[PDB]
Amino acid sequence: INDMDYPLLGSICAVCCVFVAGSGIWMLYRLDLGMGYSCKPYKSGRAPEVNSLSGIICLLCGTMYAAKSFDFFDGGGTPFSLNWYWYLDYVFTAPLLILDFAFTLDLPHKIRYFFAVFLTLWCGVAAFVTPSAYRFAYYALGCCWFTPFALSLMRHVKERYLVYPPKCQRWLFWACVIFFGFWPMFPILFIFSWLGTGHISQQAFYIIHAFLDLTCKSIFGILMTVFRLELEEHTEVQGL
Amino acid sequence: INDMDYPLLGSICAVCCVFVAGSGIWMLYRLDLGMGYSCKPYKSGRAPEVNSLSGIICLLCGTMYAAKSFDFFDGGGTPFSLNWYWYLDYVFTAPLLILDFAFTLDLPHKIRYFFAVFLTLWCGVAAFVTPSAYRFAYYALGCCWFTPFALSLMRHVKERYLVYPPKCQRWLFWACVIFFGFWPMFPILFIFSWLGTGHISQQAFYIIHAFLDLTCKSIFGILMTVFRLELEEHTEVQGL
Amino acid sequence: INDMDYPLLGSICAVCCVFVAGSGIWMLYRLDLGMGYSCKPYKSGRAPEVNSLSGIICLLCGTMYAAKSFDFFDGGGTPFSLNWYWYLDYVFTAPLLILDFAFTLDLPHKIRYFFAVFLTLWCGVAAFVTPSAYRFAYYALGCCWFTPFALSLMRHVKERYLVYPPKCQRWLFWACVIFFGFWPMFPILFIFSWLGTGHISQQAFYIIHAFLDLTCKSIFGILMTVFRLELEEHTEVQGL
Ligand SMILES: CCCCCCCC/C=C/CCCCCCCC(=O)OC[C@H](COP(=O)(O)OCCN)OC(=O)CCCCCCC/C=C/CCCCCCCC
Ligand SMILES: CCCCCCCC/C=C/CCCCCCCC(=O)OC[C@H](COP(=O)(O)OCCN)OC(=O)CCCCCCC/C=C/CCCCCCCC
Ligand SMILES: CCCCCCCC/C=C/CCCCCCCC(=O)OC[C@H](COP(=O)(O)OCCN)OC(=O)CCCCCCC/C=C/CCCCCCCC
Ligand SMILES: CCCCCCCC/C=C\CCCCCCCC(=O)OC[C@H](COP(=O)(O)OCCN)OC(=O)CCCCCCC/C=C/CCCCCCCC
Ligand SMILES: CCCCCCCC/C=C\CCCCCCCC(=O)OC[C@H](COP(=O)(O)OCCN)OC(=O)CCCCCCC/C=C/CCCCCCCC
Ligand SMILES: CCCCCCCC/C=C\CCCCCCCC(=O)OC[C@H](COP(=O)(O)OCCN)OC(=O)CCCCCCC/C=C/CCCCCCCC
Ligand SMILES: CCCCCCCC/C=C\CCCCCCCC(=O)O[C@H](COC(=O)CCCCCCC/C=C/CCCCCCCC)COP(=O)(O)OCCN
Ligand SMILES: CCCCCCCC/C=C\CCCCCCCC(=O)O[C@H](COC(=O)CCCCCCC/C=C/CCCCCCCC)COP(=O)(O)OCCN
Ligand SMILES: CCCCCCCC/C=C\CCCCCCCC(=O)O[C@H](COC(=O)CCCCCCC/C=C/CCCCCCCC)COP(=O)(O)OCCN
Ligand SMILES: CC(C)CCC[C@@H](C)[C@H]1CC[C@H]2[C@@H]3CC=C4C[C@@H](O)CC[C@]4(C)[C@H]3CC[C@]12C
Ligand SMILES: CC(C)CCC[C@@H](C)[C@H]1CC[C@H]2[C@@H]3CC=C4C[C@@H](O)CC[C@]4(C)[C@H]3CC[C@]12C
Ligand SMILES: CC(C)CCC[C@@H](C)[C@H]1CC[C@H]2[C@@H]3CC=C4C[C@@H](O)CC[C@]4(C)[C@H]3CC[C@]12C
Ligand SMILES: CC(C)CCC[C@@H](C)[C@H]1CC[C@H]2[C@@H]3CC=C4C[C@@H](O)CC[C@]4(C)[C@H]3CC[C@]12C
Ligand SMILES: *C\C=C(C)/C=C/C=C(C)/C=C/C1=C(C)CCCC1(C)C
Ligand SMILES: *C\C=C(C)/C=C/C=C(C)/C=C/C1=C(C)CCCC1(C)C
Ligand SMILES: *C\C=C(C)/C=C/C=C(C)/C=C/C1=C(C)CCCC1(C)C
C-alpha cells in the first residue's frame, strides 16, 4: 500500500547516494596516483583496468540511489523507478562485486562467480514480481544458486587468506565479514519481509537495504581499496 | 488461446531442466580435474576461464527451464514468464554458444560472431511481439543476419576441421550436425508456427523447442566437452 | 500526439539504414584485407578483435534503423518500437563508440569510459519516461555523468594527438569534431525538445537525430577506419 514515508526513504537514499558516490570518487582518485601508500607511480602510467571496478560500482550504486530518491521524492511509482522491480539493479552491481573480488585475490572460476551472482539475483527479480506459491520456488532456485556460490568461495578465500602478510589480512578479514556475513542477509530479509513471514515492514525493508549497500558497495569498496594499497606496497616497493 | 496443456509443457521443461543442468554440472566437474582423459592436472592449477563457458550455458539454460516450468505450473502468464516473449532468453545463451565454439576452435571474428547471433535473436524477439505484416520483416531482418552468419561459419569450420586428428574430428563433426543442422531449424519452425504458415501447433511449438535446446545446449555442450578432452589429450600429454 | 509524418520518418530511417549498414559492411571488408593502404596481410592471419568494433556498431546501428522504420511504417506504437523509449538503443551503441575510440588511441580508463557513457544514457532513458519536475533531475544526473566524461577525454585525446604523424592527425581531428562537437548536441536537443523548452518539434526531433547518428556512427566509423589505415601504414610497413 502506497502509504510509507517516501520523503524519509528518499532522504536516506540521497544521504547514502553522496556517501557511496563520494567514496567511489575517492577510491578512483586514490587509485590513479599510487600503487601503494608511498604513491608509487605506475611504471607504464595507467592503472590496471580491472582495479577501477571497485570505484565504478559505487558510482554505479550512487547513480542508482539518486534515481531511487527521485522515485521516492516524486511519490513512488515512477516510470523509471528502480524500486518497483527489486534486485533489478543488483543484477548490474552485485555480479561486478564478485568480479573485482575474484580479480583482487586472483580467485579462479571468475565467469562461474559472475554467473553465480547474476543468476542468483534474476531469481530474486522473478521472485518479487510473482505473487504466488512459486515465489519461493524462485527463491529456492535462487538459493540453489547462491548456496553453492557462498560455498567454494569460502574455500577459495581460505586457500589464499593464509598467503597474504598480516597487514593485508586485516582488511581481507574485514572484507570477508562484509562478504560472508552480510551478503547472506539479503535472502534472510526476503523470508521475513511482507513477501514471506511478514516481519520486515514494507517501509523498513528499504531502509535496512539502503544501509547494507553502503557496507556491500562503499565500505566493501573502501576495504578492497585499502587492501589493494597494502597488497601492492608489500609486493612492489618492498619485493616481499 | 490459454487452453494448451501447461502441466505437460511444464513437466517437459522440468525433465529437461534436470538433464541440461545435470549435464552442465558434469562438464564443469569434468573440466576442473583433467586437461584430457588422463585427467592431466592444469600446470598452473586453474582451468582456462573460456573453457567453463560450455557448462555455464547449460546451468544458464537449466535455470531458465526451471523458470519456464514455474510459468507453466502456475497456469501461464506469470509476471516473470520467460515464455511470453520468445527467444528472449536465447539472446543470453545462443550468443554464448558461438562464443565458446569460436573459443574452442580459435575461430576468428568472435565479436562479429557474438553480434551476429545477438542481433539475430533480437529480431526474433521483435518478430514475435509484433502481430502485423512487419513480423516477417523482422524475420527477414533476422534472416538477413543469420544467413551471413551461418555462411562463413561453414567456411571457418571447414578450414580447421582438416587440421584436427581423426579422433577429435568425430566429435566436431557431431558438433557441426548439431550446429549447422539444428540451428537452421529455429527459423523453420517460426515460418510454420501459428505466426506464419500455421502448421506447428501453439502447444507443440514449445515441446519441439524444449527438445532442441537439449541438442543445442546440453548435447552440444557434451560434444564440445568431449571434443576438448580429445583435443588436449592429443596435444598436451602426447605433444602431437 | 500521433500526427507526425511517420512515412517520412520511416523513409529517413530506411535511407540512413542502408548508408550506415553499408558503411559498416565496407569497413569490415576493408579491415580483413589490409593493415594499411598497401593491404598488408595480418601476419597471424586474423584482424584484431577490437578493430572490428567500428564496423559492428554501424551494422548494430543499421539493424536498429531498420526496426525504427518498421515502427514508423506501421504507424508507430509497435510492441518492439525502439522509438517509444528514447536513447534505449544508444545504451548499446554509444558505450561501444567510446570503447573502440579508447582502443584505437589506447586511451586509459576504458572501463570508466564505458560506464561514463553507459550511465549517461540510462539517465536519458529515465528522463524521457518520467514526465515530471524530476525529468531534468535525471538530465542533471545524466549531465553530471557526461560533463566529467567529456572532460578528461579532451585531456586524454590532446596528450596523444601530438604523437601521431600529420597524416594521421587529420582524420583524428575530424574524429574529434564528430566526437567533441556533435556528442554534446544530444543534450542540447533534449533541452529544446518538447520535453523542455519546446523548440524542437516532436517530428523534427527524430529527423535531426537520424542525421546525427550517421556522423556519430557511420561517418565516425569511417574516420576511425581511415585513421587506423593511416596509423598502421605509418607504423607497420614503414616502421616509423
Ligand atoms: C538512472 C541510472 C540507472 C543506471 C542503470 C539502469 C539499469 C536498470 C533498468 C531499470 C528499469 C526500470 C523499470 C521500472 C518500471 C516501473 C513501473 C512502475 O513504476 O509501475 C507502477 C506505476 C503505477 O503507479 P501509479 O499509476 O502511481 O499507481 C497509483 C495510482 N495513482 O505504473 C506506471 O507509472 C506506468 C509505467 C510507465 C511505463 C514504464 C516505463 C519503464 C521505463 C522503460 C525504460 C527501461 C528499459 C528496460 C529495457 C526493456 C524495455 C522494457
Ligand atoms: C530465473 C532465471 C532467469 C535468468 C535470466 C533472465 C533474463 C531474461 C529476462 C526475462 C524477462 C521476463 C519478462 C516477462 C513478462 C511477462 C508478461 C506477462 O506474462 O504478461 C501476461 C499477463 C496477462 O495474463 P493473465 O492476466 O493471466 O491473462 C489472462 C486473464 N486472466 O500479464 C501479467 O501477468 C502482468 C505482468 C506484470 C508485470 C510484468 C513484470 C515482468 C518482470 C520484470 C522483471 C524483468 C526486468 C526486465 C528489465 C527491463 C524492465 C522492464
Ligand atoms: C531489431 C534489432 C534490435 C537490436 C537490439 C535491441 C535492444 C533494445 C531493446 C528494445 C526494447 C523495445 C521495447 C519497446 C516497447 C514499446 C511499447 C509501445 O510501443 O507502447 C505503446 C503502444 C500503445 O500504442 P497504440 O495502442 O497504438 O495507441 C494508440 C491507440 N490506438 O502500446 C502497445 O502497443 C503495447 C505494447 C505491447 C507490449 C510491449 C512488448 C515489448 C517487446 C518485449 C521484448 C523486449 C524485451 C525487453 C527485456 C525486458 C522484458 C520487458
Ligand atoms: C550520487 C550522484 C551520482 C554519482 C556519480 C555522479 C558523477 C560522478 C563524477 C564522475 C565519475 C567518473 C567519470 C568517468 C569518466 C572519466 C574518466 C576518468 O575519471 O579518468 C580518470 C581521470 C584522471 O586520470 P589520470 O590517470 O590523471 O590521466 C592520465 C592518464 N594516465 O580523471 C580525471 O580526469 C578527473 C575527473 C575529470 C576531470 C574534469 C574536471 C572537471 C569536471 C567537472 C565537474 C562536474 C561535476 C561532477 C562532480 C564530480 C567530478 C569529480
Ligand atoms: C535446473 C535447476 C537450475 C540449474 C542450476 C542450479 C544450481 C547449480 C549448482 C551450482 C552451479 C555452479 C555454482 C557456481 C559458483 C561456484 C564456483 C565453482 O563451481 O567453482 C568450482 C569449484 C571447484 O573448483 P576446483 O578447481 O576444485 O578449486 C580449486 C581452485 N583451482 O566447485 C566446487 O567447489 C564444487 C561446487 C561447490 C562446492 C560446495 C559443496 C556444497 C554445495 C551445496 C549444494 C547445494 C545444492 C546445489 C546442487 C548442486 C551443487 C553441485
Ligand atoms: C540495414 C539492414 C540491417 C544491417 C545489417 C544486415 C546484415 C549485414 C550482413 C552481415 C553482417 C556481418 C555478419 C557477421 C557474421 C559473419 C562473420 C564475418 O563477417 O566474418 C568475416 C568473413 C571474412 O573473413 P576473412 O578474414 O576472409 O576469413 C578468413 C579467416 N581469417 O566474412 C565473410 O565471410 C564475408 C561475409 C559472409 C560470406 C557469405 C557470403 C554469402 C552471404 C549471403 C548474403 C545474405 C544477405 C546479406 C547481405 C550482406 C552480406 C555481406
Ligand atoms: C559502525 C560504524 C560504521 C560507520 C560508517 C563508516 C563511515 C566511513 C569511514 C570509513 C569506513 C571504512 C574504513 C575502512 C578502514 C580504512 C581506514 C584506514 O585506516 O585507512 C588507512 C588509509 O586508507 C584510507 O585513507 C581509507 C580511509 C578513507 C575513507 C574515506 C571515507 C569515505 C569517503 C567519503 C567521502 C565523501 C562522502 C560525502 C559526505 C557524506 C554525506 C552523508 C589504512 O591504513 P591504517 O590502518 O590507518 O594504517 C596507517 C598507516 N598506513
Ligand atoms: C537419439 C537419442 C538421443 C538421446 C539423448 C542423449 C542422452 C545423453 C547421452 C549422451 C549424449 C551425448 C554423448 C556424446 C558422445 C560422448 C559419449 C562418449 O563415449 O564419451 C566418452 C567419454 O566422455 C564422456 O564421458 C561423455 C559422456 C557423458 C555423458 C553424460 C550424460 C549427461 C549428464 C547427465 C547427468 C544428469 C542428468 C539427470 C537425469 C535425467 C533426468 C531426466 C568419449 O570417449 P569414447 O568415444 O567412449 O572413447 C572411449 C575411450 N576414450
Ligand atoms: C557535409 C556533407 C556530408 C555528406 C555525407 C557523407 C557521405 C559519405 C562520404 C564519405 C564521408 C566520410 C569520408 C571521410 C574521409 C575519407 C575519404 C578518403 O579520402 O579516404 C581515403 C581512402 O579511404 C576510403 O576509401 C574512405 C572513403 C570511403 C567511404 C565510402 C562511403 C561509405 C560507404 C557506403 C556504401 C553503401 C551505402 C549505400 C548507398 C546509400 C543509399 C542511401 C583516405 O585517403 P585520402 O585522404 O584520399 O589519400 C589518398 C591517398 N591515401
Ligand atoms: C556476525 C556477522 C557480521 C559475520 C558472521 C560471519 C563471520 C563470523 C565470518 C565471515 C568471514 C569469516 C572469516 C573468513 C576467513 C577466515 C580465514 C580462515 O583461515 C580462518 C577463519 C576466518 C577468519 C573466517 C572466520 C569467520 C568469519 C569472520
Ligand atoms: C540432417 C540434419 C540433421 C543435418 C543436415 C546438415 C548436415 C548434412 C551437415 C551439418 C554439418 C556438415 C559437415 C560440416 C563439416 C564438414 C567438413 C568438410 O571438410 C566436409 C563436409 C562436412 C563433413 C559437412 C558435411 C555436411 C554436414 C554433416
Ligand atoms: C534475406 C535472405 C537471406 C532470405 C532469408 C529470408 C527469407 C527466408 C524470408 C524473407 C520473407 C519471408 C516470407 C515472408 C512472409 C511469409 C508469409 C507467411 O504466412 C509464410 C512464410 C513467408 C512466405 C515467409 C517465408 C520466409 C521468407 C521468404
Ligand atoms: C563547430 C562544431 C561542429 C565543433 C565545435 C568543437 C570544435 C571547435 C572542437 C572539437 C575537437 C577540437 C579539437 C580537439 C583536439 C585538438 C588538439 C589540440 O592539440 C589543439 C586543439 C584541437 C585541434 C581541438 C580544437 C577544437 C576542436 C576542433
Ligand atoms: C549490493 C550487493 C550485493 C552483493 C547484494 C546481494 C544480494 C544477494 C546475493 C541476494 C540473494 C537472493 C537470494 C539468494 C534469493 C532471494 C533473492 C535475493 C536476490 C535476495
Ligand atoms: C539455444 C541455442 C540456439 C543457438 C538457438 C538459436 C536460434 C536461432 C539461431 C534463431 C534464429 C531466428 C531467425 C534467424 C529468424 C526468426 C527468429 C529466430 C530467433 C527463430
Ligand atoms: C549514437 C552515439 C552517440 C554517442 C550518442 C550519444 C548521446 C549522448 C552522449 C547523450 C547524452 C544525454 C545527456 C547527457 C543528458 C540527457 C540525455 C542524453 C542521453 C541526451
- The 3-state DSSP composition of chain A as helix, strand, coil percent (nearest 5) reads 70, 0, 30
Contact of C21 with C63, CB cutoff 8 Å: yes
- Report the alpha-carbon distance of residue A66 to residue C164 in Å, rounded: 41
Please count the other Cβ atoms lying within 10 Å of the Cβ belonging to residue B53.
22
Q: Write the single-letter amino acid at B178.
A: I
Handedness of CA A229, A213, A21, C98 (dihedral sign): positive
- Report the alpha-carbon distance of residue B39 to residue B55 in Å, rounded: 18
Nearest CA to ligand 14 atom 5: A94
Using the mean position of ligand 1's atoms as its centre, give its distance from the Cα of residue A78 in Å: 6
- Report the alpha-carbon distance of residue B99 to residue B92 in Å, rounded: 11
SS3 readout for chain B: CCCCCHHHHHHHHHHHHHHHHHHHHHHHHHHCCCCCCCCCCCCCCCCCCCCCHHHHHHHHHHHHHHHHHHHHHCCCCCCCCCCCCCCCCHHHHHHHHHHHHHHHCCCCCHHHHHHHHHHHHHHHHHHHCCCCCCHHHHHHHHHHHHHHHHCCHHHHHHHHHCCCCHHHHHHHHHHHHHHHHHCCHHHHHHHHCCCCCCCCCHHHHHHHHHHHHHHHHHHHHHHHHHHHHHHHHHHCCCCC
- Report the alpha-carbon distance of residue C155 to residue C176 in Å, rounded: 12
Method by which the model was determined? cryo-EM
Contact of C20 with C214, CB cutoff 8 Å: yes
Give the minimum alpha-carbon distance from B56 to chain A in angstroms, rounded to a whole number.
Answer: 7
Contact of B117 with B111, CB cutoff 8 Å: no
Please count the other Cβ atoms lying within 10 Å of the Cβ belonging to residue C2.
8
DSSP state of A1: -
Which of C92, B81, C125 has the alpha carbon at shortest distance from A78?
A: C125
- Report the alpha-carbon distance of residue B6 to residue B83 in Å, rounded: 12
Q: Which residues of B133-158 are buried (b: 16+ CB within 10 A; e: fewer)?
A: ebbbbbbebbbbbbeebbeebeebbe
Work out the burial of residue C129: count CB atoms within 10 Å of its CB; fewer than 13 is exposed, 13-18 middle, 19 or more buried: middle
Which of C28, C225, B217, C79 has the alpha carbon at shortest distance from C233?
A: C225
CB contact under 8 A, C79 and B129: yes
Contact of C17 with C73, CB cutoff 8 Å: no
Please give the angle made by the CA atoms of B162, B163 and B166, to the nearest 5 degrees: 75
CB contact under 8 A, A108 and B74: no
Contact of B14 with B65, CB cutoff 8 Å: yes
Largest CA distance in chain B: 60
Ligand 15 and B216: CB distance under 6 A? yes
Give the minimum alpha-carbon distance from C131 to chain A in angstroms, rounded to a whole number.
Answer: 8
Contact of C125 with C88, CB cutoff 8 Å: yes
- Report the alpha-carbon distance of residue A80 to residue C169 in Å, rounded: 42
Please count the other Cβ atoms lying within 10 Å of the Cβ belonging to residue C163.
9
Give the minimum alpha-carbon distance from A112 to chain B in angstroms, rounded to a whole number.
Answer: 7
Q: How far is CA B85 from CA A126, B79, B127, B141, B229, in A?
A: 15, 11, 10, 18, 37
Q: Which residue of A has its CA nearest to B81?
A: A126
Cβ neighbours for A169, distance < 8 A, ≥ 6 positions apart: A161
Contact of A169 with A231, CB cutoff 8 Å: no
DSSP state of A151: T
Nearest CA to ligand 5 atom 41: A148
CB contact under 8 A, A63 and C145: yes
Q: Dig out the grid coordinates for C95 from the structure.
A: 558505450
- Report the alpha-carbon distance of residue B217 to residue B94 in Å, rounded: 9
Which of C221, C215, C214, C210 has the alpha carbon at shortest distance from C69?
A: C210
CB contact under 8 A, A60 and C115: yes
Pure H helices in C45-184: 53-73, 90-104, 110-128, 135-150, 153-161, 166-182
Q: How far is CA B228 from CA B95, B221, B224, C140, in A?
A: 20, 10, 6, 52
Please give the angle made by the CA atoms of C11, C17 and C23, to the nearest 5 degrees: 145
